[PDB]
Amino acid sequence: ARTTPIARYRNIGISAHIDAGKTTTTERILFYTGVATTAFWSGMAKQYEPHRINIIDTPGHVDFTIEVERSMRVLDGAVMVYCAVGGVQPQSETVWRQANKYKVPRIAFVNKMDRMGANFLKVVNQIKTRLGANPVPLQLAIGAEEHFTGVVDLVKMKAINWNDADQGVTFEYEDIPADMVELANEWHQNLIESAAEASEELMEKYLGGEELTEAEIKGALRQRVLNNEIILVTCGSAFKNKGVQAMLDAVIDYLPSPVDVPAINGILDDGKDTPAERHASDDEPFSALAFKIATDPFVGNLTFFRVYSGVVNSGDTVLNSVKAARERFGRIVQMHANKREEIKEVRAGDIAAAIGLKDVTTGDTLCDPDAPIILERMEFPEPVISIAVEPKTKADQEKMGLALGRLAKEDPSFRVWTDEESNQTIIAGMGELHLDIIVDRMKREFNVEANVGKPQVAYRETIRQKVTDVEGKHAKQSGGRGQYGHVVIDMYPLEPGSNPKGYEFINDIKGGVIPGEYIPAVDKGIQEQLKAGPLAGYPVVDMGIRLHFGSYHDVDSSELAFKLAASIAFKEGFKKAKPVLLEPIMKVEVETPEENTGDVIGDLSRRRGMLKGQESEVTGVKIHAEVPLSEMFGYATQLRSLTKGRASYTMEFLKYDEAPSNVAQAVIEARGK
């Protein structure tokens, strides 16, 4: 029974730079349609059969662009929202590159045409010049700012005027304003020329002076959008309510259905990585991608999944091929217009959520157990900022682990580990505003009382002076039998990192002054003392010890007596050897626009960052600097402030250098206190 063709499905993302107006445009959509959300659209003139629009509203911030990446990958088409005043933003370029990576056929909506400085054609030219795109206006704005009244449809060559009294639910077709007729004819010819380029037949008609029909123009522009050759540009502004309705008609006319998109690539679970495809059909084996996990207070884990092939029912044991885990599907609803119609028939093209999946993560493939496939995996970027989180109480201690676990499950770009040296829980994320939201959820949804600090710098200990002839004599001949042990050691610094063990032991015992059986106990006594340095109780590194002189007693000498002597000798020698506190240094790489370059280093200089050099790149300059871990905290948001949000840094542990005398001494004193 032919019900609603999958060719009527529009799986679309609304994507924009932070602060551009995209969910208000979506709220306008829901109002006009009748209502991840499903909506139904029949056209602003009711000229279309009912189309199913599944909308994913993607975050504007770059701290949550990981969600945008997941969405873009799982979606068919996109609506790119631009501010008429601000135009193409640095963050728009990031989202534009992500949509290019996934080859998402997309259109453009120039919103905020009611604000001061609104300029449609300026934004069209910025899409061309900054994004390297081919923008083709479908519409022209009638007026600007407070004088914005409507739009010209360049396909129909008519003005669209929306009724302000019904919030734009009704519209009239008018003749083009007399001051715009010349400009409308110019852009109509540019639109027809852009349509004619879609095929040799349409190019011959156009060059022959034959007028293209509205159906040929629409079909030709659709083909090129699907090919990602052009971006169709629409305009309009809500509040007075304009554009959205005609942008939704452009979604039907020009954006892909699930059958217009290439088959999804995957790998067979045969151990040979055999390539396979899944076509957008109900008659194919079931395959779906889990793309979002949300924690719900009432139903538990919601796993959002997009079906690409086949059909599944609410309550169907499928196979999580990625995690090799048979997962019985839970309760599955669907946002049928306003209601949440529980669907027991998730067909190809549909987006739904399952309740109570246990071993499913974002990026997992859910498939038919009799036809295993792994759909292509999501690569998750490495976290760029880390902070220490400490529980206030012991109730908060266990609760913290639980809360952070849930947050790491729903958001892979969020990492949590315990630092083995500090025993602090370290949390890491895709920016500090990202970490701020994570902390807020932890101390609200889960209400876990925690302090936010900085990852403790891994302080080390070493000497800066050879000391010779250091006597250690454990002579405890008391309490029954005596315990005699006597060693003489030299202590000397090693070059930093010259020994992968951080420690050298030289046995230079001559004359059997110490029996060879006790020499391992002396070394073990030193190695235990290396774990807790005599200066501040940090591990001692980059040190050599030569045992060359010693003495035993035939009855009273013990293995651990010589280990006690070794510790005495070590503690006395270490204090004489001018002990110092060490530091880690981090190799930092910053990618920035050439005009923002200066600011980056100004701050890095205050952060004790020894700028090694620079590699002027295409974006601008790739500056390299040696910056202490202590000064590499809170840099994500600071960089975002200096560079207006167009810079990305990386950092790696470089080497164990010497902390500046001031820094080292200050910490030594604080630790002693």
Partner: protein, 141 residues
């Protein structure tokens, strides 16, 4: 050539490749390609001997094309070439680095009068006398 707004005289070498990292300086608050440079220098490299950094300019025209401004291996690195002792700068007056004859520069001043442009071959000799003592040299026949 063009205005002094697309002016950085640079290029210590050609085989070290990229003139953007430390090796090649500048490339800051200016904006231009980097591999689009040494290819015209690749038809130009094999006349210059290495160890002799030649000053050329990234002169960018108004239509995105840029080539270089050839001015021959100069005073400083030829006294690290024709004498045989490198930079060592700072000590003209402390200890003896090297004395250079009168005619040892005049034979390469004809090469250096295509590098230095005040007037003449003889007239540029007393500025080969310049940076030599800043490198630390002394000069007498």
């Amino acid at each position: 050539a063009k205005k002094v707004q697309a002016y950085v005289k640079l290029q210590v070498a050609a085989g070290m490749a990229n003139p953007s990292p430390p090796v090649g300086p500048a490339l800051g608050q200016q904006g231009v390609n980097i591999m689009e440079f040494c290819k015209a220098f690749n038809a130009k490299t094999d006349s210059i001997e290495k160890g002799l950094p030649i000053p050329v300019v990234i002169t960018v025209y108004a239509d995105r094309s840029f080539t270089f401004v050839t001015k021959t291996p100069p005073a400083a690195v030829l006294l690290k070439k024709a004498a045989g002792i490198k930079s060592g700068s700072g000590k003209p007056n402390k200890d003896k680095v090297g004395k250079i004859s009168r005619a040892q520069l005049q034979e390469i001043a004809q090469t250096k009068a295509a590098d230095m442009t005040g007037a003449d071959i003889e007239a540029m000799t007393r500025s080969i006398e310049g940076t030599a003592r800043s490198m630390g040299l002394v000069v007498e026949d």
